[PDB]
Each structure stands twice: as structure tokens, then as C-alpha cells.
Amino acid sequence: NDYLQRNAIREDLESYLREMGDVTSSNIQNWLGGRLLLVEQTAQTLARDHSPETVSALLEQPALTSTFSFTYLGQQDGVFTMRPDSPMPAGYDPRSRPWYKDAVAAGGLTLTEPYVDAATQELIITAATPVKAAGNTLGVVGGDLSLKTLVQIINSLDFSGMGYAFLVSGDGKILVHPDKEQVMKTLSEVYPQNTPKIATGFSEAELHGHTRILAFTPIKGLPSVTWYLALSIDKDKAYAM
Numbered sequence: 001n002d003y004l005q006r007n008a009i010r011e012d013l014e015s016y017l018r019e020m021g022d023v024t025s026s027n028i029q030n031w032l033g034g035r036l037l038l039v040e041q042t043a044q045t046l047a048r049d050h051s052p053e054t055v056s057a058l059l060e061q062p063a064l065t066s067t068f069s070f071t072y073l074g075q076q077d078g079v080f081t082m083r084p085d086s087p088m089p090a091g092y093d094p095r096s097r098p099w100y101k102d103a104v105a106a107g108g109l110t111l112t113e114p115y116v117d118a119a120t121q122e123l124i125i126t127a128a129t130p131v132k133a134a135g136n137t138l139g140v141v142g143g144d145l146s147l148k149t150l151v152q153i154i155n156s157l158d159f160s161g162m163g164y165a166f167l168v169s170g171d172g173k174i175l176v177h178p179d180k181e182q183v184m185k186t187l188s189e190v191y192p193q194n195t196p197k198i199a200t201g202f203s204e205a206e207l208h209g210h211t212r213i214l215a216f217t218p219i220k221g222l223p224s225v226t227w228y229l230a231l232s233i234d235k236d237k238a239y240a241m
């Protein structure tokens with residue numbers, strides 16, 4: 001019987017994908033986690049002492065400048081301090097920015113979706129958290145992360161040459177993708193005819209003329225967001241083995 005045989009193949013493929021999805025999800029979980037912890041450690045220090053001299057020196061420390069493109073403090077009175085330094089656009093107010101509002105609404109450390117950077121006019125992701133002293137919020141600390149860097153991490157693996165990984169929100173918004181044109185599109189825009197369901201274990205869909213298999217894995221330990229790790233696999237290549 002070819003039905004039983006196809007059934008045996010598919011079940012094996014789905015077990016492999018589950019394994020790859022789990023461990024890739026852990027990786028990005030751990031990597032994002034360290035960044036979050038670092039921003040948190042930085043805010044808890046500023047909480048105790050946020051004099052101008054201290055703020056400057058703290059933000060210039062190598063553990064920060066080598067991890068984030070920019071690290072910064074926006075204060076509740078609107079005063080902004082960043083390292084390394086940058087030309088400043090007229091009218092800037094850190095309290096109006098997505099990283100600031102997101103941290104405040106979260107009541108603690110969180111991550112933004114991509115938003116348009118103030119200087120590069122390109123997409124950026126920020127790890128951010130409020131500065132908490134005596135139950136009060138003195139401002140928000142943020143550390144900037146490049147989309148390209150997140151891509152590289154979730155695509156360490158091949159995956160045996162079958163496909164690639166991307167990040168997508170529970171709402172269906174593509175956050176990070178090896179193909180730049182797909183970023184911040186929705187799953188419905190990319191797949192209008194038969195849209196992959198995030199809840200559903202394994203979905204088939206058609207992309208650039210080829211049948212693909214998609215599978216979604218929750219990413220744990222991201223406060224106040226719901227992000228999935230997605231695997232997108234070439235069906236014909238996978239089954240061929």
C-alpha cells in the first residue's frame with residue numbers, strides 16, 4: 001500500500017520538524033533572554049542612581065556597546081540620553097516612541113515588533129523595560145537589535161537543505177524573514193488562497209510556484225508578546241528524503 005507508506009514518511013518528517021522547531025525555538029528564546037536580562041540589569045542600576053555622569057558612563061560600558069547598536073534612557077520628563085551618540089532629528093520625544101509605550105504598558109521588560117528607526121529610517125527591534133524606583137516609573141531603558149541578526153540565529157541550521165526559519169506573531173504578522181520583502185507582511189498577504197493556520201500542527205501552502213510545509217512553535221519566556229518560530233520547508237525535497 002502506498003497510503004501506509006506515504007503515512008510512514010509524513011509521520012517521520014513531522015517528527016523531525018517538531019524536533020527542529022523545539023530546539024530552534026529554545027535558541028532564540030535563550031538569545032533574546034540574555035538581551036532582556038542585560039537591559040533589565042541596566043535599568044535596575046539606573047534606578048538607584050541616574051545622575052548625568054553616571055548615566056553617560058553606564059551606557060558607554062563595553063558589555064552594552066558591543067551587544068546593542070544603541071542603548072539609551074528616555075526619562076519621564078522627556079530627556080533622552082544615548083550611546084554611541086547620533087545626530088538628532090528635530091522634534092524628538094522618547095515618550096512618543098514604540099519602545100517607551102510598550103515597556104510602560106507591559107509594566108516590565110518586553111520586546112517591540114519592528115518599527116521605523118529615528119535615524120536610519122529602517123526597521124529595528126528594541127528590548128525595553130521601565131526604570132522602577134519606590135513603586136514609581138522614572139523612565140524606560142532600551143537596547144536596539146538588528147533584524148538581520150535575529151535571522152542568522154534562527155537559521156544556523158540547514159535544515160538538511162529542506163528549508164528555512166522565520167518569526168511570526170500570534171496575530172500572523174511576519175516579524176523577521178530571510179527574504180526582506182516578506183517582512184511585516186501578514187500570512188494572509190503572502191498566502192491569500194490557502195492561509196497556513198498557526199494553531200494547526202502542519203499546513204501545506206504554495207509559494208513562488210512550489211508546495212511548502214509550514215509549522216509553528218511557541219517561543220517561551222518573552223514577556224507581553226506572543227511570538228512563534230516558523231519553519232518553511234520544501235515539500236517535494238523533504239519527501240524525496
Ligand SMILES: N[C@@H](Cc1c[nH]c2ccccc12)C(=O)O
Pocket residue numbers: 070072086087088089092097116117118119124126144
Ligand atoms: N531606536 C530608537 C532610539 C534611537 C536610535 N537611534 C536614534 C537616533 C536619534 C534619536 C533616537 C534614536 C528610536 O528610534 O526611537
